[PDB]
């Protein structure tokens, strides 16, 4: 059998609790229930009984992972041969410099390099290596850099932020210790003031919320920093950014369904700290702000029932006047955000369930011209595109940087003249291991949800599999938050498709693939069960159209997708033969009732809050841990990370012990706990790829497919 943890009685309370904050309107008298595995939680990650139990699990795992070591190996190499070990990124102008990233063949971390404006990017005499992450990571289990921020005009000072355990709290430091300043306990973002005199950062809080924006002045003890903005509302996080012209700073608050912004003038120097309210928060209203020069505010917003968004134009001096509408609201178009430059703006968004991008110019009047809206043309019918804003460093620019991809076409970055239309390639990704696009094809089916709704499916397969009989398939899902799983290129799936499998993305509600409403009405709060039923629907479609049979079908999810997996295995475990759930959000009731767990209060406006009558029962009906029962489940691998500040390590830990406890089948439930990494990791190395390989190994093992088609 497998490890089963011991039951220690602990009551967990739902509703009102004196001294704690369980939301605006919690249940009274409260409700109670027993969680016999509560103990598995240690906030300090140090309990001997717990760490011991995790060893049992590590033993079990290793003991059971012996006979895929060799396939995971054949597959790591495929990965490597698909990755391009020595590489340069797509170099961009930032001031008097071209900036770019570099990888070297033996080495696990990027280099951050620089070449002067009019020279040629590449390892050489001109190239200054700004940061070497390998020298940072020297004899350390874990190493992630949040930000590499040089200081405007000069780029003499460069600051960076680093997390050494993955709980995602950062220190900020400077390259080669040119100065001695240190900033502790930040979210990672560094934003600069003028002339390297100071910069802006964001501290965490109770339960790791981003609740404060501060100024740091060079030459000073952090203890002397000035906090500019707190938001005390547990539903919110604070953000911070710089205006195009860099004369204006942008402070905001973002809950899931509500926004607020302020402005600070950087032209008045380090001792000027007074903010300028933009539009006072109004529940239900979300909006984002972008400056044009010092006066004109270009606001993207959902106000007045404009769900997919509308972009408005107003003045700094009368910032609540939003009667001027630049781009009006469209039912079939979602606008996800704007970027604003001296001579135009990019809108990023959606139409027909694919990423789209438009550009908007000034008129002869020097004011933004509705009539100049251009939708940007791409070649493939099913593709993915975003503007790369982390590479648009120049306010006066005329070249706009895009990343373009499809499940067939390896990624391209290229510049495009906003006016001319012409597209030069900057970098096209190379894929070795003998890969070629013409070996693959991607089309889109539509599944039918129980309520009639059409759920899109995106799929890719080697052009030479026999489609006149069922095939082994992997069906991947997300879909929470309004986040979309894109049909973009991803080498990671080649090991499956290279062995005659069909890789497939279910576009379930909760996602935002089909517009904002695919998320807000379709899959959230009291309509969150669609996420799971839409998924189940996609999978039945795959079976009855004859693409697959459940003995040949697998599924994969991560994070909130782990939630999707766990619910779906609770309901229709018969549909799968094998299943992957990385860092899976699965102990929903228990976590969601408790304000102290790092992301709970944000997400009272996502799933709901089970301290409330309105939400208790509903969430209960899909909470994976709470719905584990005596029945067959398929082979399952769970991957967790000890310092995961997003999904707590104990969550999958319980779910794994409970599955083994109740499950009546005898398939394997393995649980891989990297005690060195967090949420995203597995790792920040070649070890990421090693981790990923076992996952594919485990599946392919269970599917009984090992053999390439070439």
């Amino acid at each position: 059998r497998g490890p089963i943890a011991a039951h220690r009685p602990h009551e967990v309370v739902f509703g009102k609790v004196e001294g704690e904050d369980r939301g605006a309107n919690p249940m009274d008298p409260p409700r109670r229930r027993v969680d016999p595995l509560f103990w598995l939680r240690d906030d300090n990650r140090a309990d001997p009984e717990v760490l011991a139990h995790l060893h049992l699990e590590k033993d079990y795992y290793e003991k059971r992972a012996v006979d895929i070591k060799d396939l995971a190996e054949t597959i790591y190499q495929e990965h490597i041969s698909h990755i391009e070990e020595t590489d340069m990124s797509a170099p961009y102008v930032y001031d008097r410099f071209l900036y770019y990233t570099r990888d070297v063949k033996g080495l696990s971390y990027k280099l951050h390099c620089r070449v002067p404006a009019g020279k040629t990017p590449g390892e050489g005499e001109d190239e200054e290596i700004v940061l070497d992450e390998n020298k940072l990571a020297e004899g350390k289990s874990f190493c992630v850099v949040g930000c590499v921020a040089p200081a405007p005009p000069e780029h003499a000072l460069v600051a960076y932020s680093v997390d050494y355990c993955g709980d995602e709290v950062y220190s900020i430091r400077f390259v080669r210790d040119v100065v001695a300043d240190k900033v502790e306990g930040t979210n990672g973002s560094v934003v600069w003031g003028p002339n390297a005199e100071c910069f802006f950062y964001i501290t965490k809080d109770a339960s790791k919320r981003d609740n404060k924006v501060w100024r740091h002045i060079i030459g000073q003890p952090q203890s002397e920093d000035v906090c500019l903005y707190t938001d005390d509302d547990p539903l919110f996080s604070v953000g911070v950014g710089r205006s195009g012209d860099g004369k204006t700073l942008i402070i905001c608050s973002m809950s899931s369904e509500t926004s607020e912004s302020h402005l600070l003038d950087l032209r008045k120097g380090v001792k000027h700290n007074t903010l300028e309210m933009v539009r006072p928060r109004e529940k239900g209203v979300r909006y984002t702000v972008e400056m044009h020069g010092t006066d004109t505010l270009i606001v993207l917003t959902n106000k007045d029932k404009c769900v997919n968004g509308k972009v408005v134009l107003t003045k700094r001096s009368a910032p609540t006047d939003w009667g001027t509408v630049l781009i009006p609201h469209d039912d079939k178009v979602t606008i996800d955000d704007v970027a604003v430059f001296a001579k135009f703006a990019v809108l990023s968004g959606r139409r027909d369930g694919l990423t789209r991008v438009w550009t908007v110019r000034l008129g002869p009047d020097n004011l933004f011209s509705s009539a100049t809206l251009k939708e940007l043309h791409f070649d493939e019918p099913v593709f993915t595109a975003h503007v790369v804003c982390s590479q648009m460093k120049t306010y006066d620019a005329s070249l706009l940087r895009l990343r373009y991809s499809s499940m067939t076409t390896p990624t391209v970055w290229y510049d495009e003249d906003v006016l001319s239309g012409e597209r030069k390639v900057v970098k096209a990704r190379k894929v070795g291991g003998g890969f070629e696009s013409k070996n693959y094809v991607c089309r889109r089916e539509l599944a039918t949800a129980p309520d009639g709704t059409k759920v899109p499916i995106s799929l890719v397969y080697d052009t030479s599999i026999d489609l006149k009989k069922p095939n082994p398939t992997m069906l991947y899902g997300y879909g929470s938050y309004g986040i979309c799983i894109e049909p973009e290129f991803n080498s990671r799936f080649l090991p499956y498709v290279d062995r005659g499998m069909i890789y497939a993305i279910a576009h379930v509600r909760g996602g935002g693939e089909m517009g904002r409403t695919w998320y807000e009405v379709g899959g959230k709060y009291l309509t969150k069960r669609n996420t799971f039923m839409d998924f189940i629907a996609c999978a039945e479609h795959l079976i009855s159209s004859g693409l697959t049979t459940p003995a040949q079908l697998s599924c994969e999810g991560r994070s909130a997708g782990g939630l999707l997996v766990g619910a779906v295995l609770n309901m229709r475990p018969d549909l799968f033969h094998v299943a992957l759930a990385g860092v899976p959000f699965v102990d929903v009731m228990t976590t969601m009732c408790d304000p102290s767990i790092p992301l709970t209060t944000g997400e009272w406006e996502e799933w709901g809050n089970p301290n409330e009558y309105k939400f208790f029962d509903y969430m209960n009906s899909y909470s994976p841990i709470d719905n584990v029962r005596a029945q067959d489940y398929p082979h399952l691998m769970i991957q967790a990370g000890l310092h995961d500040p997003r999904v707590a390590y104990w969550e999958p830990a319980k779910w794994a012990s409970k599955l083994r406890e109740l499950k009546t089948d005898s398939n394997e439930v393995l649980l891989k706990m990297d005690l060195e990494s967090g949420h995203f990791s597995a790792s920040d190395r070649y070890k990421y790829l090693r981790e990923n390989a076992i996952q594919q190994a485990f599946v392919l093992k269970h599917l009984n497919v090992r053999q390439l088609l070439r």
């Binding site: 996080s237 938050y481 909130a560 959000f585 992301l599 944000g602």
Partner: peptide, 4 residues
Amino acid sequence: FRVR
């Protein structure tokens, strides 16, 4: 930036 900050999610499940």
